[PDB]
Structures are given as structure tokens and as C-alpha cells.
Design an enzyme around this catalytic site. Structure first.
Site, PDB file in Angstrom:
ATOM      1  N   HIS A   1      -0.471   5.539  16.461  1.00 13.00           N
ATOM      2  CA  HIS A   1       0.559   4.635  15.876  1.00 13.00           C
ATOM      3  C   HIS A   1       1.856   4.919  16.580  1.00 13.00           C
ATOM      4  O   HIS A   1       2.183   6.076  16.790  1.00 13.00           O
ATOM      5  CB  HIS A   1       0.655   4.885  14.371  1.00 13.00           C
ATOM      6  CG  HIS A   1      -0.587   4.555  13.666  1.00 13.00           C
ATOM      7  ND1 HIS A   1      -1.739   5.280  13.459  1.00 13.00           N
ATOM      8  CD2 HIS A   1      -0.827   3.331  13.132  1.00 13.00           C
ATOM      9  CE1 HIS A   1      -2.656   4.490  12.840  1.00 13.00           C
ATOM     10  NE2 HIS A   1      -2.108   3.302  12.634  1.00 13.00           N
TER      11      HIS A   1
ATOM     12  N   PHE B   1       1.854  10.654   1.174  1.00 11.91           N
ATOM     13  CA  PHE B   1       1.434  10.220   2.480  1.00 11.91           C
ATOM     14  C   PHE B   1       2.371   9.195   3.076  1.00 11.91           C
ATOM     15  O   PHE B   1       3.132   9.537   4.013  1.00 11.91           O
ATOM     16  CB  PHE B   1      -0.026   9.713   2.370  1.00 11.91           C
ATOM     17  CG  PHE B   1      -0.656   9.140   3.655  1.00 11.91           C
ATOM     18  CD1 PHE B   1      -0.249   9.513   4.873  1.00 11.91           C
ATOM     19  CD2 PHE B   1      -1.706   8.237   3.560  1.00 11.91           C
ATOM     20  CE1 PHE B   1      -0.838   9.007   5.998  1.00 11.91           C
ATOM     21  CE2 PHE B   1      -2.294   7.770   4.667  1.00 11.91           C
ATOM     22  CZ  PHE B   1      -1.846   8.109   5.902  1.00 11.91           C
TER      23      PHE B   1
ATOM     24  N   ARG C   1       0.869  -1.195   0.000  1.00 14.69           N
ATOM     25  CA  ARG C   1       0.000   0.000   0.000  1.00 14.69           C
ATOM     26  C   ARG C   1       0.897   1.234   0.000  1.00 14.69           C
ATOM     27  O   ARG C   1       1.618   1.442   0.982  1.00 14.69           O
ATOM     28  CB  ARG C   1      -0.952  -0.008   1.179  1.00 14.69           C
ATOM     29  CG  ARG C   1      -1.911   1.150   1.184  1.00 14.69           C
ATOM     30  CD  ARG C   1      -2.762   1.104   2.466  1.00 14.69           C
ATOM     31  NE  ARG C   1      -3.634   2.283   2.586  1.00 14.69           N
ATOM     32  CZ  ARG C   1      -4.756   2.394   1.936  1.00 14.69           C
ATOM     33  NH1 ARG C   1      -5.040   1.378   1.093  1.00 14.69           N
ATOM     34  NH2 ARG C   1      -5.624   3.418   2.053  1.00 14.69           N
TER      35      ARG C   1
ATOM     36  N   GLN D   1       3.524   1.576   3.010  1.00 18.50           N
ATOM     37  CA  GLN D   1       3.229   0.596   4.009  1.00 18.50           C
ATOM     38  C   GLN D   1       3.656  -0.801   3.542  1.00 18.50           C
ATOM     39  O   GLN D   1       3.359  -1.218   2.435  1.00 18.50           O
ATOM     40  CB  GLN D   1       1.785   0.554   4.357  1.00 18.50           C
ATOM     41  CG  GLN D   1       1.400  -0.418   5.458  1.00 18.50           C
ATOM     42  CD  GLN D   1       0.036  -0.278   6.011  1.00 18.50           C
ATOM     43  OE1 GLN D   1      -0.528   0.829   5.977  1.00 18.50           O
ATOM     44  NE2 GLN D   1      -0.509  -1.299   6.584  1.00 18.50           N
TER      45      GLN D   1
ATOM     46  N   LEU E   1      -1.851  11.023  13.133  1.00 13.07           N
ATOM     47  CA  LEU E   1      -1.574   9.657  13.614  1.00 13.07           C
ATOM     48  C   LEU E   1      -0.942   9.663  15.000  1.00 13.07           C
ATOM     49  O   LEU E   1      -0.788   8.561  15.591  1.00 13.07           O
ATOM     50  CB  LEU E   1      -0.730   8.918  12.559  1.00 13.07           C
ATOM     51  CG  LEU E   1      -1.335   8.838  11.181  1.00 13.07           C
ATOM     52  CD1 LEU E   1      -0.379   8.183  10.221  1.00 13.07           C
ATOM     53  CD2 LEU E   1      -2.652   8.098  11.227  1.00 13.07           C
TER      54      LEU E   1
ATOM     55  N   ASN F   1      -1.500  -0.651  12.484  1.00 13.42           N
ATOM     56  CA  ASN F   1      -2.271  -1.425  13.448  1.00 13.42           C
ATOM     57  C   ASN F   1      -3.745  -1.399  13.034  1.00 13.42           C
ATOM     58  O   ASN F   1      -4.111  -0.737  12.089  1.00 13.42           O
ATOM     59  CB  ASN F   1      -2.016  -0.919  14.866  1.00 13.42           C
ATOM     60  CG  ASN F   1      -2.515   0.464  15.072  1.00 13.42           C
ATOM     61  OD1 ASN F   1      -3.673   0.781  14.738  1.00 13.42           O
ATOM     62  ND2 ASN F   1      -1.652   1.342  15.614  1.00 13.42           N
TER      63      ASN F   1
ATOM     64  N   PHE G   1       4.794   1.556   8.438  1.00 17.07           N
ATOM     65  CA  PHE G   1       4.772   2.477   7.353  1.00 17.07           C
ATOM     66  C   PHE G   1       5.889   3.504   7.479  1.00 17.07           C
ATOM     67  O   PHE G   1       6.359   3.796   8.586  1.00 17.07           O
ATOM     68  CB  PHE G   1       3.395   3.154   7.144  1.00 17.07           C
ATOM     69  CG  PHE G   1       2.902   3.949   8.358  1.00 17.07           C
ATOM     70  CD1 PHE G   1       2.303   3.316   9.437  1.00 17.07           C
ATOM     71  CD2 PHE G   1       3.028   5.320   8.386  1.00 17.07           C
ATOM     72  CE1 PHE G   1       1.837   4.015  10.512  1.00 17.07           C
ATOM     73  CE2 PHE G   1       2.538   6.025   9.481  1.00 17.07           C
ATOM     74  CZ  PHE G   1       1.930   5.372  10.548  1.00 17.07           C
TER      75      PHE G   1
END
EC number: 5.2.1.8
Length: 168
Positions: free
Chosen positions: A130, A64, A59, A67, A126, A106, A117
Site C-alpha cells: 500500500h 488497526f 470499515r 478506511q 502493509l 487497493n 485508510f
């Protein structure tokens, strides 16, 4: 054994459709998040018999993050920590301050596995959700290169793999 603890450095050798791209190295913040750093470090060396070598970045959202770490199912539904079960959020001392931050993926509180990521921007929303546990040290340009093969929905247009990984 007489030396003070030094935060470990680990590397990924990235490939794109099998073609070597380059090496990304990371500092892992063992001084702040030792349990979370250790998981990543051992997954990167493969020293326990499993880990990231040969896995993919499944991903990637340009602007951004990238991942990866789903070495069991290759698609974001799997992964396994070195502790067997998913493990706790160790702390939230470190924040998502900018590009190069390494943070755990997660599915909610206290569900850390192996997925992680690499931020390509500041992702402050985040924070507290995270666990940040490292940062790119060298080869952020390699991250930038690989990020170009992502898309808005995260699907990659070329296969992005961790051809090799280990500890420097």
C-alpha cells in the site's frame, strides 16, 4: 508562484450520526508521491466536481485502521481516482510506521482509486503493498474517537461521515 513546493494540508470535518465530531488534518507527501498526493488533495477539495465530501468511513477496525474514500458505492466496492482509471503504485518509499499514517487501499498491485485508510497502529505488514502518502497532522484524537465506533469485522455502529473537507 515563487515559493518552493510545500506539502499540502487537507482537512476532514467528521460527523457521527450527523453530529459534528471534529476536524482531522493531514500532511500529504507531495514531495515523495506527487501523483498519489494530488489525487487525495483534489478529492478533498472537490475542485474537479467530485470527491470525499459527504462520503463515509465504511470499515473501521479498532486497533488497526479506519478506511474510507468510497464515494461512489459507500461500502468498499467503489471509488474513483481523478485520473479516470485506477492508477499505479507510485512508489513504496514511505512505510507504515505508526498511528496517523495515511495510505492507499487497493485490490492488488497498481489498483489505486480513491479509497484510503488511516492507521491507528503500526501496520508494517502493509509495507510494499500500500502506498503511504500522508500523515495526520492535527486531530489524531478525532480519529481515535471515531475508531471507537468500529468493530472487529469492520462494521461501524454509528454512521461516520466526512461532513466537509478541503485544503488549508
Amino acid at each position: 508562484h515563487h515559493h518552493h513546493h510545500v506539502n499540502p494540508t487537507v482537512f476532514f470535518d467528521i460527523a457521527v450520526d450527523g453530529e459534528p465530531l471534529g476536524r482531522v488534518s493531514f500532511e500529504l507527501f507531495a514531495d515523495k508521491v506527487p501523483k498519489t498526493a494530488e489525487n487525495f488533495r483534489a478529492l478533498s477539495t472537490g475542485e474537479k466536481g467530485f470527491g470525499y465530501k459527504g462520503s463515509c468511513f465504511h470499515r473501521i477496525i479498532p486497533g488497526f485502521m479506519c478506511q474510507g474514500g468510497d464515494f461512489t458505492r459507500h461500502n468498499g466496492t467503489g471509488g474513483k481516482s481523478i485520473y479516470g482509471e485506477k492508477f499505479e503504485d507510485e512508489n513504496f518509499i514511505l512505510k507504515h510506521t505508526g498511528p496517523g499514517i495515511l495510505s492507499m487501499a487497493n485490490a492488488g498491485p497498481n489498483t489505486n482509486g480513491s479509497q484510503f485508510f488511516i492507521c491507528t497502529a503500526k501496520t508494517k505488514w502493509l509495507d510494499g503493498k500500500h502506498v503511504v502518502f500522508g500523515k495526520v497532522k492535527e486531530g489524531m484524537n478525532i480519529v481515535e474517537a471515531m475508531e471507537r465506533f468500529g468493530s472487529r469485522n469492520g462494521k461501524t455502529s454509528k454512521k461516520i461521515t466526512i461532513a466537509d473537507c478541503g485544503q488549508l
